[PDB]
Design a protein around this ligand. Structure first.
Ligand SMILES: [Zn+2]
Ligand SMILES: [Zn+2]
Ligand SMILES: [Zn+2]
Length: 79
């Protein structure tokens, strides 16, 4: 299971996978969540950008990295 309780997710995105950012919750535009981590309950009427990862964009999910978020998140995988 995708739980990573007590540490950062750090799941590496693959090309074609969904990535989630939130204007309000993210510290900057590079702060992102994977589909296993993103919880809609954290982001009601927030300005959520869901993109499809490309060859150009590449990186890791920031869930559990509190240095990347303005609000406490609640991992979807933890539910
Ligand atoms: Zn994740
Ligand atoms: Zn997570
Ligand atoms: Zn949000």
């Amino acid at each position: 299971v995708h739980k990573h309780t007590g540490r950062n997710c750090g799941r590496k995105f693959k090309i074609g996978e969904p990535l989630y950012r939130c204007h309000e919750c993210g510290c900057d535009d590079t702060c992102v969540l994977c589909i296993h981590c993103f919880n809609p309950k954290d982001h009601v009427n927030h300005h959520v950008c869901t993109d499809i990862c490309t060859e150009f964009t590449s990186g890791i999910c920031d869930c559990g990295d509190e240095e990347a978020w303005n609000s406490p998140l609640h991992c979807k995988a933890e539910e």
